[PDB]
Design a binder for this molecule. Sequence first.
Ligand SMILES: [Cl-]
Ligand SMILES: [Cl-]
Lengths: 160, 18
Amino acid sequence: RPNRLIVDEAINEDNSVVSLSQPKMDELQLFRGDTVLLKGKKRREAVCIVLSDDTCSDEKIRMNRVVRNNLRVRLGDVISIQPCPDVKYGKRIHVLPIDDTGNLFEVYLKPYFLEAYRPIRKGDIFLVRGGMRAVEFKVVETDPSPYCIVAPDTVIHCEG
Amino acid sequence: VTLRRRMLAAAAERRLQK
Ligand SMILES: [Cl-]
Ligand SMILES: [Cl-]
């Protein structure tokens, strides 16, 4: 059967990271920086980097509200986690802001992604802090699909 | 040469140490 963990709250508010206990990582043969595929409710998936967290109970997983929201889960729910070793570097991504001023790229997207090597999945909604406010974006498309690592050479289109 | 997962982890750790 799949490998299952209890959703816990993150104290590190990074959109791209989930935390496990080192003992649980050993068991699951996951290592620092490994990309993992998380499965939640409503056939939702998320792709994140895994890091150890000495504050995490073996049976729990720390993830922020962005990740939880993407998986349609609440604190205390159960998710599955499996390795996702076939992730490619992104050639091109299409992101749109959730429309409900300034350069979205220069103020939000560039600083967010810059040398950050964040794994993303098509359909992700993520929140970027910046310019006093904070904005959410939806990942409309990635290439390769349906997920990729957003690298320094990855081309973003933010429109349409 | 370097291993990819380590690059991904190091970038995230930098974000958390800030
Ligand atoms: Cl390592
Ligand atoms: Cl290395």
